[PDB]
Amino acid sequence: AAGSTMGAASMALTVQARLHMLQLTVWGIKQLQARVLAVERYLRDQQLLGIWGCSGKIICCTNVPWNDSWSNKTINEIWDNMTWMQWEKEIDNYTQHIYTLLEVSQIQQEKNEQELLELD
Amino acid sequence: AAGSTMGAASMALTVQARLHMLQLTVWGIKQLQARVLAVERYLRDQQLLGIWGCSGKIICCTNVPWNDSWSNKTINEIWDNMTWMQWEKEIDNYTQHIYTLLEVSQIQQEKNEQELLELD
Amino acid sequence: AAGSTMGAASMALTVQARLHMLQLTVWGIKQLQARVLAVERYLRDQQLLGIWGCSGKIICCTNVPWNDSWSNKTINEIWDNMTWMQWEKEIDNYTQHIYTLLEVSQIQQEKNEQELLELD
Amino acid sequence: AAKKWVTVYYGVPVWKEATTTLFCASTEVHNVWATHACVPTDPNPQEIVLGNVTENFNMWKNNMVEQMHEDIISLWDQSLKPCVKLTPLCVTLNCNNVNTNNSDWEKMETGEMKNCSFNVTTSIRDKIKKEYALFYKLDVVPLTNYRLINCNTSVITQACPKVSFEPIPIHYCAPAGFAILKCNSKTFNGSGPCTNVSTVQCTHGIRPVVSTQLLLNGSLAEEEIVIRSENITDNAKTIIVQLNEAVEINCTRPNNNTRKSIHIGPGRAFYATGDIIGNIRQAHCNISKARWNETLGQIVAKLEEQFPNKTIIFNHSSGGDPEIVTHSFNCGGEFFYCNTTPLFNSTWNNTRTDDYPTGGEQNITLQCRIKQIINMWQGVGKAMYAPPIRGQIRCSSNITGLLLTRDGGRDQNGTETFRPGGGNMRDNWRSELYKYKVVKIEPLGIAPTACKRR
Amino acid sequence: ETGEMKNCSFNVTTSIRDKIKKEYALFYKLDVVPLTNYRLI
Numbered sequence: 049a050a051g052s053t054m055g056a057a058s059m060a061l062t063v064q065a066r067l068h069m070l071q072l073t074v075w076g077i078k079q080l081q082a083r084v085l086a087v088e089r090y091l092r093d094q095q096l097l098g099i100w101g102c103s104g105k106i107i108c109c110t111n112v113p114w115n116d117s118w119s120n121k122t123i124n125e126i127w128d129n130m131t132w133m134q135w136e137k138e139i140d141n142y143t144q145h146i147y148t149l150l151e152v153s154q155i156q157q158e159k160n161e162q163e164l165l166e167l168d
Numbered sequence: 169a170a171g172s173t174m175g176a177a178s179m180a181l182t183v184q185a186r187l188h189m190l191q192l193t194v195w196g197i198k199q200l201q202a203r204v205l206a207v208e209r210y211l212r213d214q215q216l217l218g219i220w221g222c223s224g225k226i227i228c229c230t231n232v233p234w235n236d237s238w239s240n241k242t243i244n245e246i247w248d249n250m251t252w253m254q255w256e257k258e259i260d261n262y263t264q265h266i267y268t269l270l271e272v273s274q275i276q277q278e279k280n281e282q283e284l285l286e287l288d
Numbered sequence: 289a290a291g292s293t294m295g296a297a298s299m300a301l302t303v304q305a306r307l308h309m310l311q312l313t314v315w316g317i318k319q320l321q322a323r324v325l326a327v328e329r330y331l332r333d334q335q336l337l338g339i340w341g342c343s344g345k346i347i348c349c350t351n352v353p354w355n356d357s358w359s360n361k362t363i364n365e366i367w368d369n370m371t372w373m374q375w376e377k378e379i380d381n382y383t384q385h386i387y388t389l390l391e392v393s394q395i396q397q398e399k400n401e402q403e404l405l406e407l408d
Numbered sequence: 409a410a411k412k413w414v415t416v417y418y419g420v421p422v423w424k425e426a427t428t429t430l431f432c433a434s435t436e437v438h439n440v441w442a443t444h445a446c447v448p449t450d451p452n453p454q455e456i457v458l459g460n461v462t463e464n465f466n467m468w469k470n471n472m473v474e475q476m477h478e479d480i481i482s483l484w485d486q487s488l489k490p491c492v493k494l495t496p497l498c499v500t501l502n503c504n505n506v507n508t509n510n511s512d513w514e515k516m517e518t519g520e521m522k523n524c525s526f527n528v529t530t531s532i533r534d535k536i537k538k539e540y541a542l543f544y545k546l547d548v549v550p551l552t553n554y555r556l557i558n559c560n561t562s563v564i565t566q567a568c569p570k571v572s573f574e575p576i577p578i579h580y581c582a583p584a585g586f587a588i589l590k591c592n593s594k595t596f597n598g599s600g601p602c603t604n605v606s607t608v609q610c611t612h613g614i615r616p617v618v619s620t621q622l623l624l625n626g627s628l629a630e631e632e633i634v635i636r637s638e639n640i641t642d643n644a645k646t647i648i649v650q651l652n653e654a655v656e657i658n659c660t661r662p663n664n665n666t667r668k669s670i671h672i673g674p675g676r677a678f679y680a681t682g683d684i685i686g687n688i689r690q691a692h693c694n695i696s697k698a699r700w701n702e703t704l705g706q707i708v709a710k711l712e713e714q715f716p717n718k719t720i721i722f723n724h725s726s727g728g729d730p731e732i733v734t735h736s737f738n739c740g741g742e743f744f745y746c747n748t749t750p751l752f753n754s755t756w757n758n759t760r761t762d763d764y765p766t767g768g769e770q771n772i773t774l775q776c777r778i779k780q781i782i783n784m785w786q787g788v789g790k791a792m793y794a795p796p797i798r799g800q801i802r803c804s805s806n807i808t809g810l811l812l813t814r815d816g817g818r819d820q821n822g823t824e825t826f827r828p829g830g831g832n833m834r835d836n837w838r839s840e841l842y843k844y845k846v847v848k849i850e851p852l853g854i855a856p857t858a859c860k861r862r
Numbered sequence: 863e864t865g866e867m868k869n870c871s872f873n874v875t876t877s878i879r880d881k882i883k884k885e886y887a888l889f890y891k892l893d894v895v896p897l898t899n900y901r902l903i
């Protein structure tokens with residue numbers, strides 16, 4: 049119910065997953081831009097997931113605590129009883145803080161500590 | 169012998185792995201299209217493997233049974249004693265059925281069940 | 289200290305991580321090339337890491353021994369007491385040898401042996 | 409009992425408003441609007457219905473309309489680029505009239521179709537030949553000596569005589585990573601909140617129809633006539649009336665007009681009107697009187713609610729250049745300009761139409777003129793010369809809506825006056841794209857969890 | 863100024879191809895050369 053809990057309105061689904069010569073014509077140039085852009089957007093998300101160690105995940109679990117200054121609501125107030133769009137707005141100002149925390153130490157230290165453990 | 173079992177004729181190998189200013193000239197436009205297309209084809213395969221949880225794999229093992237309606241031949245009739253091209257033709261009509269099964273539940277449930285197990 | 293050990297001068301950091309209509313104008317064509325190229329370079333590195341089984345790694349550990357013909361210096365002579373640029377020059381002639389070894393057997397055999405182990 | 413942890417979800421159903429470049433999707437006629445460069449559409453373009461969501465749409469602030477406007481202009485141009493520029497025809501024209509007196513009422517010509525001779529350099533640069541062509545009155549101006557209208561100050565390019573202008577539906581498609589939301593509410597009216605929202609990768613096809621006063625071959629209202637405006641009170645805004653039923657309009661140019669080919673340069677052939685075989689007649693359009701009467705009865709009821717008690721007055725255009733103050737459409741390359749005075753003929757009480765006397769008349773006639781030198785978008789793009797297309801031209805179309813404006817709205821007598829006005833062609837496309845919004849998808853999101861990574 | 867800014871007349875085809883009009887313009891000395899008849903440099 050992971051995709052059903054965060055509001056009934058989760059129905060945007062994955063239209064983004066659903067998604068001749070290159071003639072530089074009035075419509076052709078626009079078609080080129082559309083293809084180049086689709087690639088760029090895909091990679092920006094994939095690279096960020098790669099950085100956090102979430103490259104192969106749909107849902108990834110991390111070692112960074114929730115903090116609670118971003119939002120002090122609980123699991124049944126945030127995860128349940130809420131729609132994803134509302135949620136992203138509620139913590140929009142912490143996007144960079146959180147992304148920074150998801151990489152810093154969380155991937156960087158985790159990997160350096162493993163490097164040391166793997167020497168044994 | 170994984171690359172030798174499925175017919176002697178496995179010698180296409182990986183030519184696809186082997187693979188100045190952008191002037192929009194008669195040859196230049198074609199060169200651009202070739203580069204854009206190579207990227208698009210690469211990503212279509214990589215994204216699908218990512219979806220199935222096979223992103224880092226050469227050969228990935230799954231939790232979805234063979235079904236046997238697609239083909240009722242056995243391992244030594246399909247895996248051995250057969251060439252890959254013949255095989256892809258033999259089960260061509262099940263491509264979407266199989267791809268759907270490789271994602272649905274197989275990645276989706278596997279990850280949601282792990283989310284629950286990781287709460288302990 | 290993995291990013292500090294290999295010379296004090298490790299400060300190039302990751303500027304590469306930091307990184308409207310497509311009109312084909314004098315500046316516009318150059319902008320297109322810049323975007324296409326950024327994608328191509330990103331993918332060339334990501335694909336190679338994928339091949340070696342290092343797709344989700346910052347630092348990946350392998351099963352291929354150092355050999356010592358490439359360089360017979362020790363860990364505290366190479367890893368420490370050296371700058372990364374000097375190091376890449378010191379073993380530049382072994383780049384293809386090493387890359388070949390990182391894939392051949394190391395990923396290929398490791399995965400085929402796992403295929404056999406996973407049959408139990 | 410547990411700590412909350414930060415977890416990342418990918419495939420999160422959220423979005424933000426965004427404007428991007430759209431691409432199009434869809435016989436060797438080189439159609440200019442729907443070129444071979446269009447990708448084919450999806451035979452099964454499954455629509456995704458959203459759940460309890462709301463969204464804010466505004467057809468008057470819709471960048472899809474603006475993007476389409478630029479695309480239509482770019483497609484018009486470019487397609488006309490590799491063609492004959494007709495500069496050599498800008499010479500003195502020695503013109504006279506023709507004899508139209510060969511009982512064809514409502515079809516008679518009166519002093520138009522001038523017979524002009526001219527001195528044009530032939531394909532060989534040191535040789536000049538006298539040539540003849542017939543011109544529509546609206547294509548020439550006097551200096552009797554005449555010149556082609558708009559020769560001074562502009563370049564009139566002849567369309568390549570193989571290229572079709574027939575509108576073919578064009579679908580707009582979002583790039584992957586983007587989606588188009590549409591409002592399906594019966595109560596939408598082109599603005600504000602919408603609760604019935606669904607999304608597509610591509611829009612329905614839109615015919616790139618160009619017209620004035622009457623909107624042709626667009627979509628019909630699902631059930632009832634809808635009057636849309638940015639502002640009802642502001643008389644300066646265009647009021648778009650979308651019909652729920654089409655009204656047929658049948659247009660004829662009943663002449664055997666045979667063309668002539670004139671060489672004015674090295675591979676540069678001018679296609680002249682040549683001459684007429686048989687009795688020359690003016691073009692005309694017919695509509696069904698009964699349908700017009702029903703249509704207007706329903707429109708007045710709707711305008712009366714917006715403007716209660718007051719007399720409804722329909723009137724003709726305010727007057728001006730018969731390029732923009734008349735009805736306009738294109739059938740096979742022939743450009744028609746028609747007098748719509750008879751359609752916006754009168755005024756009435758309540759919601760009861762009147763002053764259209766009962767009689768044997770079944771077909772309301774509109775007198776039309778033909779122009780070969782035209783200016784789509786007036787000053788944007790280039791003037792174009794339409795080749796003649798060999799005679800007996802007939803076409804018909806669906807009136808799907810009207811563009812109305814208010815005539816000042818300063819009448820102190822308890823009346824309101826509407827005219828078949830309107831602005832830039834953006835109004836036509838706005839009337840079809842009114843239900844769509846472009847958004848970007850942001851699939852990566854953040855939420856608290858109770859899990860922790862090993 | 864000393865002998866520059868020449869007043870030149872010329873016969874130029876108008877927007878209508880069979881009509882020629884006499885026009886006037888002033889030119890900087892450095893923009894013209896003699897052949898008094900001059901041509902644009």
Ligand SMILES: *[C@@H]1O[C@H](CO)[C@@H](O[C@@H]2O[C@H](CO)[C@@H](O[C@@H]3O[C@H](CO)[C@@H](O)[C@H](O[C@H]4O[C@H](CO)[C@@H](O)[C@H](O)[C@@H]4O)[C@@H]3O)[C@H](O)[C@H]2NC(C)=O)[C@H](O)[C@H]1NC(C)=O
Pocket residue numbers: 437574575617624625737738739740802803804805806
């Ligand atoms: C609103 O929609 C209607 C249709 O629903 C549309 O009317 C159609 O217009 C097209 C314009 O091309 C007509 O097609 C022509 O039909 C005649 C019939 O004999 C043909 O001769 C024409 O041939 C031309 O193109 C050929 C291409 O090779 C040339 O070889 C030839 O020499 C001609 O140039 C052409 O097929 C179509 O028949 C009508 N439909 C009806 C039912 O009359 C109308 O125009 C749309 N409204 C607006 C405002 O666009």
Ligand SMILES: *[C@@H]1O[C@H](CO)[C@@H](O[C@@H]2O[C@H](CO)[C@@H](O[C@@H]3O[C@H](CO)[C@@H](O)[C@H](O)[C@@H]3O)[C@H](O)[C@H]2NC(C)=O)[C@H](O)[C@H]1NC(C)=O
Pocket residue numbers: 512513514658660692693694771773
């Ligand atoms: C467009 O509208 C005009 C105007 O009504 C139509 O012209 C009309 O056509 C009818 C039918 O032919 C004429 O009525 C009768 O025709 C018979 C034919 O023999 C004649 O014998 C009768 O005496 C009578 O004339 C009608 O008079 C005529 N109107 C005019 C002004 O002449 C036209 O046909 C319509 N068609 C199209 C394609 O738009």
Ligand SMILES: *[C@@H]1O[C@H](CO)[C@@H](O[C@@H]2O[C@H](CO)[C@@H](O)[C@H](O)[C@H]2NC(C)=O)[C@H](O)[C@H]1NC(C)=O
Pocket residue numbers: 505506507523524540542683684
């Ligand atoms: C326009 O004028 C031209 C010439 O003034 C007409 O063409 C003439 O038609 C007669 C008919 O017998 C011929 O005998 C002449 O030799 C033609 N002249 C030329 C130069 O070809 C043309 O028909 C006129 N068009 C109209 C509608 O009156």
Ligand SMILES: *[C@@H]1O[C@H](CO)[C@@H](O[C@@H]2O[C@H](CO)[C@@H](O)[C@H](O)[C@H]2NC(C)=O)[C@H](O)[C@H]1NC(C)=O
Pocket residue numbers: 500501502525526527
């Ligand atoms: C086309 O050229 C002819 C001459 O080749 C022009 O006819 C002459 O016009 C002059 C004007 O004064 C008369 O004096 C001559 O007597 C005319 N010659 C003839 C044979 O009639 C003709 O007017 C030019 N046509 C146009 C439209 O410029």
Ligand SMILES: *[C@@H]1O[C@H](CO)[C@@H](O[C@@H]2O[C@H](CO)[C@@H](O)[C@H](O)[C@H]2NC(C)=O)[C@H](O)[C@H]1NC(C)=O
Pocket residue numbers: 455457592593594604605606
């Ligand atoms: C609310 O939205 C749904 C989906 O947009 C509408 O469902 C349509 O219902 C008509 C009725 O015949 C069908 O023909 C359409 O095919 C349905 N749409 C789809 C995408 O299947 C529903 O009618 C809307 N409700 C209101 C009041 O407009």
Ligand SMILES: *[C@@H]1O[C@H](CO)[C@@H](O[C@@H]2O[C@H](CO)[C@@H](O)[C@H](O)[C@H]2NC(C)=O)[C@H](O)[C@H]1NC(C)=O
Pocket residue numbers: 596597599600601635637640714
């Ligand atoms: C088109 O729809 C909009 C949105 O419902 C109407 O605007 C509303 O008008 C009422 C009139 O009192 C206001 O109270 C609302 O606050 C307006 N809504 C918004 C979002 O501003 C608009 O009037 C409608 N057009 C017509 C012709 O009825």
Ligand SMILES: *[C@@H]1O[C@H](CO)[C@@H](O[C@@H]2O[C@H](CO)[C@@H](O)[C@H](O)[C@H]2NC(C)=O)[C@H](O)[C@H]1NC(C)=O
Pocket residue numbers: 625654805806
């Ligand atoms: C103009 O309106 C008429 C009907 O008033 C349209 O004719 C219908 O077209 C559909 C297209 O599939 C047919 O299925 C119907 O059977 C037709 N109706 C009749 C009564 O035959 C006509 O297509 C409309 N033209 C345009 C351009 O939309």
Ligand SMILES: *[C@@H]1O[C@H](CO)[C@@H](O[C@@H]2O[C@H](CO)[C@@H](O)[C@H](O)[C@H]2NC(C)=O)[C@H](O)[C@H]1NC(C)=O
Pocket residue numbers: 639640641642
């Ligand atoms: C719709 O247009 C009307 C007409 O301009 C606007 O109402 C006017 O608002 C100005 C504001 O200073 C007043 O001075 C005028 O007296 C108002 N006119 C009338 C007739 O009351 C109206 O505000 C516009 N609506 C929106 C939403 O902008």
Ligand SMILES: *[C@@H]1O[C@H](CO)[C@@H](O[C@@H]2O[C@H](CO)[C@@H](O)[C@H](O)[C@H]2NC(C)=O)[C@H](O)[C@H]1NC(C)=O
Pocket residue numbers: 656657658694695696771804
């Ligand atoms: C425009 O032409 C169409 C046909 O070309 C006319 O439609 C016909 O109307 C008659 C009236 O009884 C029907 O019996 C026919 O079946 C209709 N034909 C088709 C194809 O539907 C239409 O009425 C004309 N409209 C005008 C205003 O003249």
Ligand SMILES: *[C@@H]1O[C@H](CO)[C@@H](O[C@@H]2O[C@H](CO)[C@@H](O)[C@H](O)[C@H]2NC(C)=O)[C@H](O)[C@H]1NC(C)=O
Pocket residue numbers: 721723724755
């Ligand atoms: C339709 O528009 C015409 C044109 O404006 C109106 O006729 C004008 O009426 C005023 C009234 O004083 C006269 O001063 C003008 O001189 C008239 N114009 C012309 C050209 O005669 C006409 O009255 C309008 N229709 C209705 C019902 O009001």
Ligand SMILES: *[C@@H]1O[C@H](CO)[C@@H](O[C@@H]2O[C@H](CO)[C@@H](O)[C@H](O)[C@H]2NC(C)=O)[C@H](O)[C@H]1NC(C)=O
Pocket residue numbers: 730734747748749
């Ligand atoms: C449209 O047609 C009407 C007539 O159907 C033209 O108006 C007529 O102009 C003559 C000129 O003397 C008057 O005598 C008539 O009384 C006018 N009739 C009406 C109803 O006003 C009108 O000018 C034409 N308009 C265009 C744009 O061509």
Ligand SMILES: *[C@@H]1O[C@H](CO)[C@@H](O[C@@H]2O[C@H](CO)[C@@H](O)[C@H](O)[C@H]2NC(C)=O)[C@H](O)[C@H]1NC(C)=O
Pocket residue numbers: 750751753763764765767769772
């Ligand atoms: C616009 O109004 C005029 C009258 O003001 C209508 O003219 C009448 O049309 C009928 C149709 O056959 C004729 O029998 C009458 O003799 C006409 N009257 C006059 C004074 O000429 C005209 O038809 C109206 N337009 C429409 C579409 O009905």
Ligand SMILES: *[C@@H]1O[C@H](CO)[C@@H](O[C@@H]2O[C@H](CO)[C@@H](O)[C@H](O)[C@H]2NC(C)=O)[C@H](O)[C@H]1NC(C)=O
Pocket residue numbers: 658694768769770771
């Ligand atoms: C009104 O217009 C319609 C359509 O133009 C006329 O219908 C014509 O009817 C005759 C009857 O034999 C047919 O032969 C024609 O082919 C029909 N026309 C078309 C275009 O198909 C109708 O007669 C007109 N009515 C009046 C009273 O004039």
Ligand SMILES: *[C@@H]1O[C@H](CO)[C@@H](O)[C@H](O)[C@H]1NC(C)=O
Pocket residue numbers: 115116117
């Ligand atoms: C969240 O992290 C910031 C980082 O400085 C810290 O200052 C803040 O106190 C933390 N919030 C809570 C509620 O612990």
Ligand SMILES: *[C@@H]1O[C@H](CO)[C@@H](O)[C@H](O)[C@H]1NC(C)=O
Pocket residue numbers: 120121122
């Ligand atoms: C979060 O802290 C704010 C501080 O004022 C408080 O008002 C709000 O009610 C708190 N929310 C929860 C869920 O405790």
Ligand SMILES: *[C@@H]1O[C@H](CO)[C@@H](O)[C@H](O)[C@H]1NC(C)=O
Pocket residue numbers: 129
């Ligand atoms: C959601 O939060 C609201 C806040 O008023 C509360 O009334 C409602 O009962 C909650 N719903 C659930 C399912 O807990």
